[PDB]
Amino acid sequence: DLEKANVRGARAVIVDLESDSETIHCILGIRKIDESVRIIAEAERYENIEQLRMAGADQVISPFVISGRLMSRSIDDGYEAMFVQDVLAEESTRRMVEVPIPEGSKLEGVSVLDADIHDVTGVIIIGVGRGDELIIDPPRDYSFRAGDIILGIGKPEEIERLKNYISA
Amino acid sequence: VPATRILLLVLAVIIYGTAGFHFIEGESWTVSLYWTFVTIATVGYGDYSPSTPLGMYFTVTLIVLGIGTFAVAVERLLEFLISRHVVICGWSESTLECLRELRGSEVFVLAEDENVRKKVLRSGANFVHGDPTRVSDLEKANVRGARAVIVDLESDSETIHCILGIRKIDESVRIIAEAERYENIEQLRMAGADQVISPFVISGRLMSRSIDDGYEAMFVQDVLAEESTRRMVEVPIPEGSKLEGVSVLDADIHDVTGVIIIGVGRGDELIIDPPRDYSFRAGDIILGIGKPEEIERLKNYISA
Amino acid sequence: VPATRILLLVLAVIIYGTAGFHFIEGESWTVSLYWTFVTIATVGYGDYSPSTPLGMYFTVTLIVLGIGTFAVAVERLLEFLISRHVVICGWSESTLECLRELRGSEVFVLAEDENVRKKVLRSGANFVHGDPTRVSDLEKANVRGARAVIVDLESDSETIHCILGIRKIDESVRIIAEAERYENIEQLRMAGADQVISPFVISGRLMSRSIDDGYEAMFVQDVLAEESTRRMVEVPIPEGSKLEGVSVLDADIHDVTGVIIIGVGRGDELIIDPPRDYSFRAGDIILGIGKPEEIERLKNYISA
Amino acid sequence: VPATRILLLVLAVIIYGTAGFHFIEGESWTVSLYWTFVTIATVGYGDYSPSTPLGMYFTVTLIVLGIGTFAVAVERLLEFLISRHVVICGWSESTLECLRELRGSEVFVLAEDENVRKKVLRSGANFVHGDPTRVSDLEKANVRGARAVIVDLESDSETIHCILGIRKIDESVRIIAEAERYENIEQLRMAGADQVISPFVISGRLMSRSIDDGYEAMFVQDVLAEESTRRMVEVPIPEGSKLEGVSVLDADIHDVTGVIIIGVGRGDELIIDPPRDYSFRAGDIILGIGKPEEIERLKNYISA
Amino acid sequence: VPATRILLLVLAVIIYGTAGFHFIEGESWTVSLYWTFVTIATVGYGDYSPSTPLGMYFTVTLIVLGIGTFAVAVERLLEFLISRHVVICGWSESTLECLRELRGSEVFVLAEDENVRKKVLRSGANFVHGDPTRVSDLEKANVRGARAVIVDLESDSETIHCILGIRKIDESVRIIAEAERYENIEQLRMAGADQVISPFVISGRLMSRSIDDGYEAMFVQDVLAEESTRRMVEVPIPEGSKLEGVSVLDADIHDVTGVIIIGVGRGDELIIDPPRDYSFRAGDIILGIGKPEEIERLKNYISA
């Protein structure tokens, strides 16, 4: 019944079943068929995240851990929960985006201090990602590479200015 | 048997014994009271004892009627001799991780299931048995003196009922509710919750944004964890600081400190990525991301 | 162990101790009996005690055989020592509010469920476990001597069945029933109910008369609540009163007393807004609304 | 704790107390033993008591080590000092009326529900908790030594399972089963029930024959009741009677006695309204209807 | 109540009584301490007793506060004065028969239900309440030191989850699983099970091979039952035996010993009906069927 639903030709599989044992079983059944498809799982318990990542899921998203950490941090004032719940909605004025660095750009080897993204463009640079790691608030000696992913927050005019600023 | 009834029964035995000994044996009221206690407790010093046949018969009756009554009374007596807090209504996984993050504070848990008391007492929180929708059981768990109430019940109807019960008790306490469905967010805000945290909407948007590459989910689940090098903390601008009237363009907080100023909040409104001519005030809550050394440097920079 | 067997065992110990002390130590039968109680109860005054080696050995045997036996006997004894009524058949919300207003009297609640025992005993009524449709379980709850029986069961067929059972037991008691549907009011009155109260018909009529403005529902739910200023009282006309044979036009109750005469009743009939030619009799019940000062003025007005 | 170990512990306390009092206070071994019992039992007459500081300290140690030990010892001692039947599997209304008709005989009841023990013990039958389909619980209820087992379970599958369990235990006992459906009669006979009583088939045929006038249902429900003047009893023809070889046409039992001979049975076969040339034997069971005077006359007529 | 707290409470009573008697009645500290013990133990010799009204009142207070406290203290004191295991995860029929054959060893049954405790303790195993999928509830049941873990849960996903948890705890223990479907045997072996037993595949193959005549099912269910005459035994070849380097054609086990050589095993492989050129080694396991006399003859045959 997995091979019914075209897992081989797919580009991403999202696994959210009724329990976590069923999620690990379905992830093993998916990895039986296509060993390179992207799997996004969902952990119903905190202990099972390393098991869901060992079983084969590329990205594990645990909603109850995020909910508990946003509940415990909103006792005083909930600016963090407001930030998290408002940056994700595709209706607001500011958007969190991923902008890739093309080959032949103007920022090969350029450090983030000399690049000066926030004053020139207006995009808040919260992280520079590469491969399967994300470096949140990178230090000033961080030299860019062609192939890095810049994760930022800004108005879409600032996003267009950032794409035109890093363009080759 | 209710403790108060046992109290009356033992008092009646005491009156019976004291009056009987006084009238039959002719000892004073005080001696007779003392003799009655000594006898029904089975101490029996023998400094006083009946010397008449009637007194002997009476004493046997007091022994039979009084020793058991006194024994039950003493055992019942044994039982009675032997910032603010946070109240949690309902038991789920979200409240479990919230209770993990709330160590060092006094936490009550109001839940209907009796067989969760072991995990509530192991997590470090006092368990209060009851129904969270009922006002009397809400009241017992000290909703009045709390600083925040966290409501996570099975459905949204019970959550709205709990929020309205808490608003019937205390109109000033903080309610943090959790939405199970998307459309009930505005209704949970209408009932009186101060902030509604909808976890399945966040999870669905992260699962939708994690198709190409999952940097957003990594960012959220990393900065919410208090284990990384960078921490999301809110610094307040104190009364009488160097930053009143100064815009963020004149400030350059990321240039002088190294924290990433991702938002400035006032009251219950937050503006993410504020524009350059946004004038700072005293009381605006700065939401930033940085190392704790940068956090202490930011506190020293915005000082009075 | 059956209580009666424990009784025999303790009596046997008492005989053994009394005869032994009498024969070995030479004290009177009465002193020996008293000494036996004092000893096996572990009181031990010491006014009497053995003075011979045989008596000492005997006393140790009595201690071993008697103290445990007496202890078990007293604890078993503990268990046995430790207008007219109203019977309520079934447990629901209507009987709950009826029990809330009926404080001070003796109420026996007859119900099938055993888990309602704690809430019945906390509301202030003696719980009688049974089936309200069975005749034997009705006779267990003392229906014969009661002054009213309130029937409210799960369906309407069960209510007619319980009414038929009570009428098989007693042909004079007052039965109050609750109808679930409008069609069964005549069947409940034919089966023997002295008054049928239909809550859903009242609720539907109030919900349909509350569309424009709901002063009818406010009037009903304010004069039935015993916390408001005005109360709906029934004031009976005594024999030999001043108002035997006067019309209600000539009597003029409202201006002289302050009460509002909404109706008068006789036997099992009621005349709402009685016309001016209605001549009063003795024994009539006056249904009125007023402040309790006006109620006492009306009561002093209709005196003999 | 094993009783014998408690015995050793109390003996050790007794040795400790007796030797201590003898050596410290200088009383005789016998007095010291007596004092030890009086003290550890908490009797405390005070005829003997310590008079030295060492004796006082020692006595407090004996009190602490000895009173609990003696208490546990006496309570353990307390414990040591202090035709055939019919088994019914399952509890229904049919078994309730069967148990009403079976007064004076020893009846076991094997049922799964624990909350029927009160009505089983009130009806006059011993209650055995268990599952009737399991062979161990079938065995406990003494199926081996019974004379008849009556099976009335919730369905026909459980009834057939119970019949096969009883046939696994005893192949000679009598099983009386009840069919809930019509088509399972031959299967309940295949499993091993000696007679299958299908009540809904009898009820349906009486309800079908009672449309015009209900004389058949009146006849059945009247002659089965042991309250009418006529009774359906089975008389056996004894060995060596006057009726062997004599046909019913030569007999004229209704002419000489007045009973109505409605059937003659042999073994497990019954022929209702037998023809005139049916030759009687010795051992044929005559099924008749008549008054008990006619029954005694019929017994005197067919005698040896 | 913790024993140490009860200790403090009784010490506090002792201080209260001793100081009170000393100051009110004027006896020495030692006599006052002794009197306090004699009184709160309810011994009451009467060698010392209060002689003033204040002392009498005080004594009644000590009696009430002290007798219960002392009683609880002595009972608490009473308490202080007076190969490797196999873990079974889940409870079903297969684990029940496995527990029936595994008598003599130590078995820890880990199960979610609490009502299986009595049948687990009656089958002869220590019950450990928990969830077999959780890692902490696995580590509670001592999986680390066991010699085999038997996993049989409700579904196959739960079985794979429990196997992954045990492999996270221990990488050397032997895991035996039970497959519900034929597709999950390879997933259970990849997840880490040392042996997967599929009962439904064996049952389906035996039911399909029992159409013509069922000698296969009789063979399997007779050689697995340890009540028959023949037993299926594994006989290991020791180091230094007489059969190192001989073929099975030249060894000729069956005529000289009487056993039937159905297969030989090495490591984790098995060769059923091994060909005649198979040369024996040391450490090989011989799987055979025979009478125990033939088994002992084979064991003496393969000696060093």
Query: Token match 């007999």: residue?
Result: D251
| Contacts with A95 (C-beta within 8 Å, 6 or more apart), sequence order | A87, A153, A154, A155, A156, A159
Q: Read off the DSSP letter of residue D30.
A: H
Interface probe for B, chosen from C14, C45, C121 (most Cβ of B below 10 Å), is C45
Interatomic CA distance for residues E218 and E210, integer angstroms: 10
Give the gap in angstroms from C-alpha E71 to the nearest C-alpha of chain C: 15
Interatomic CA distance for residues B26 and B19, integer angstroms: 10
CA distances from D206 to D183, D200, D271, E288 (A): 19, 10, 21, 69
Question: Which of B220, B254, B291 lies closest to A84 in CB terms?
Answer: B220
Interatomic CA distance for residues C128 and D88, integer angstroms: 30
Give the gap in angstroms from C-alpha D45 to the nearest C-alpha of chain B: 8
A102: left (phi over 0), alpha (psi -120 to 50) or beta: beta
Beta bridge mates, E86: E107, E148
Tokens of C43: 């009181």
Alpha carbon B239 to chain centroid, angstroms:
32
| Contacts with E14 (C-beta within 8 Å, 6 or more apart), sequence order | E33, E36, E37, E40
D126 contacts D107 by C-beta, under 8 angstroms: yes
Q: Report CA torsion sign: C163, C167, C170, C174.
A: positive
Residue B92 sits in a domain whose CATH number is 3.40.50.720
Q: D289 phi and psi, to 5 degrees?
A: -130, 125
Interface probe for D, chosen from E43, E72, E82, E123 (most Cβ of D below 10 Å), is E43
Residues of C with CB under 8 A from a CB of B: 30-31, 33-34, 37-38, 41-47, 74-75, 77-78, 81-82
**D72 and D138 within one domain:** no
D58 contacts D76 by C-beta, under 8 angstroms: no
**C255 and C177 within one domain:** no
E-C interface (Cβ pairs under 8 Å ≥ 3): yes
Of the candidates D149, D151, D208, D218, which has an alpha carbon nearest to the alpha carbon of residue D180? D151
Chain breaks in chain C (C to N over 2.5 A) after: 82
Question: Which of A20, A32, A47 lies closest to E135 in CB terms?
Answer: A47
Residue B216 sits in a domain whose CATH number is 1.20.5.870
Interatomic CA distance for residues E20 and E149, integer angstroms: 64
D113 contacts D91 by C-beta, under 8 angstroms: yes
Consult the annotation and say whether D194 binds a ligand: no
Q: Where do the H-state alpha helices sit in B153-243?
A: 156-169, 185-191, 199-209, 215-223
Residue A160 sits in a domain whose CATH number is 3.30.70.1450
Q: Which domain range does residue B279 map to? A: 227-304
- Count Cα neighbours of D179 within 13 Å in the Cβ-side half-sphere: 22
Of the candidates C133, C128, C126, which has an alpha carbon nearest to the alpha carbon of residue C169? C133
D64 contacts E77 by C-beta, under 8 angstroms: yes
Total of domains in chain B: 4
Give the gap in angstroms from C-alpha B42 to the nearest C-alpha of chain E: 6
Query: Token match 């125990």: residue?
Result: E292
Of the candidates E193, E161, E197, E205, which has an alpha carbon nearest to the alpha carbon of residue E180? E197
Question: Resolution reached, in Å?
Answer: 4.5
Query: Token match 């008598």: residue?
Result: E103
What method did the depositors use to determine the structure? cryo-EM
Chain breaks in chain B (C to N over 2.5 A) after: 82
C130 contacts C112 by C-beta, under 8 angstroms: yes
**D179 and D94 within one domain:** yes
Q: CB neighbours (10 Å) of residue E83?
A: 8
The reply to whether residue D46 touches residue B45, judged by beta carbons under 8 angstroms, is yes
B66 contacts B39 by C-beta, under 8 angstroms: yes
Interatomic CA distance for residues C232 and C262, integer angstroms: 10
D89 contacts D29 by C-beta, under 8 angstroms: no
Interface probe for E, chosen from D5, D48, D67, D137 (most Cβ of E below 10 Å), is D67
Q: What is the DSSP string of C254-276?
A: HHHH--EEEEEEETTEEEES--T
Of the candidates C291, C297, C289, C296, which has an alpha carbon nearest to the alpha carbon of residue C229? C291
**C300 and C236 within one domain:** yes
Q: What is the DSSP string of C10-77?
A: HHHHHHHHHHHHHHHH---HHHHHHHHHHHHTT----SS---SHHHHHHHHHHHHHHHHHHHHHHHHH
Q: A86 phi and psi, to 5 degrees?
A: -105, -20
Beta bridge mates, C290: C231
In chain E, what residues touch B33 (CB-CB under 8 Å)? 56, 60
**B210 and B189 within one domain:** no
Helices B53-81 and C29-40 sit at what angle, rounded to 10 degrees? 10
**Geometric angle at alpha carbon D185, from D182 and D188, rounded to 5°:** 140
B92: nearest CA partner in chain A: A64
Q: CB neighbours (10 Å) of residue E119?
A: 14
**C100 and C188 within one domain:** yes
**Geometric angle at alpha carbon D12, from D10 and D14, rounded to 5°:** 70
Q: CB neighbours (10 Å) of residue D105?
A: 15
B265 contacts A79 by C-beta, under 8 angstroms: yes
Q: What is the 3-state secondary structure (H, E, C) of chain E?
A: CCHHHHHHHHHHHHHHHHHHHHHHHCCCHHHHHHHHHHHHCCCCCCCCCCCCHHHHHHHHHHHHHHHHHHHHHHHHHHHHHCCCCEEEECCCHHHHHHHHHCCCCCEEEEECCCCCHHHHHHHCCEEEECCCCCHHHHHHCCCCCCCEEEECCCCHHHHHHHHHHHHHHCCCCCEEEECCCHHHHHHHHHHCCCEEECHHHHHHHHHHCCCCCCHHHHHHHHHCCCCCCCEEEEEECCCCCCCCCCEHHHHCHHHHHCCEEEEEEECCEEEECCCCCCECCCCCEEEEEECHHHHHHHHHHCCC
Residues E89/E94/E96/E98 CA torsion (nearest 10 deg)? -90
With b for 16 or more beta-carbon neighbours within 10 A and e for fewer, the D191-205 pattern comes to bbbeebbbeeeeeee
**A140 and A100 within one domain:** yes
CA distances from B96 to A67, B109, B155, C220, E164 (A): 10, 11, 17, 48, 24
**E166 and E68 within one domain:** no
**Geometric angle at alpha carbon A161, from A155 and A166, rounded to 5°:** 130
Interatomic CA distance for residues D37 and D21, integer angstroms: 12
**D126 and D43 within one domain:** no
B273: nearest CA partner in chain A: A154
Of the candidates B163, B212, B166, which has an alpha carbon nearest to the alpha carbon of residue B189? B163
The reply to whether residue B46 touches residue E44, judged by beta carbons under 8 angstroms, is yes
Tokens of D165: 């369990």
H or E segment and range at residue D202: helix D199-209
**A134 and A74 within one domain:** no
H or E segment and range at residue D249: helix D248-251
With b for 16 or more beta-carbon neighbours within 10 A and e for fewer, the C210-230 pattern comes to eeeeeeebeeeeeeeeeeeeb
CA distances from A52 to B94, B217, E8, E157, E187 (A): 19, 16, 52, 13, 15
In chain A, what residues touch B152 (CB-CB under 8 Å)? 71
**D235 and D207 within one domain:** no
| Contacts with B171 (C-beta within 8 Å, 6 or more apart), sequence order | none
Q: B125 phi and psi, to 5 degrees?
A: -140, 145
Chain breaks in chain A (C to N over 2.5 A) after: none
Provide the pairing of β-strand D126-129 with D107-111.
Answer: parallel
The reply to whether residue B42 touches residue D45, judged by beta carbons under 8 angstroms, is no
Give the gap in angstroms from C-alpha E29 to the nearest C-alpha of chain D: 11
Tokens of D74: 């006496």
In chain E, what residues touch D4 (CB-CB under 8 Å)? none
Helix (H, G, I), strand (E, B) or coil at D47: coil
**C189 and C207 within one domain:** no
Provide the pairing of β-strand B285-290 with B231-236.
Answer: antiparallel
Interatomic CA distance for residues E214 and E206, integer angstroms: 8
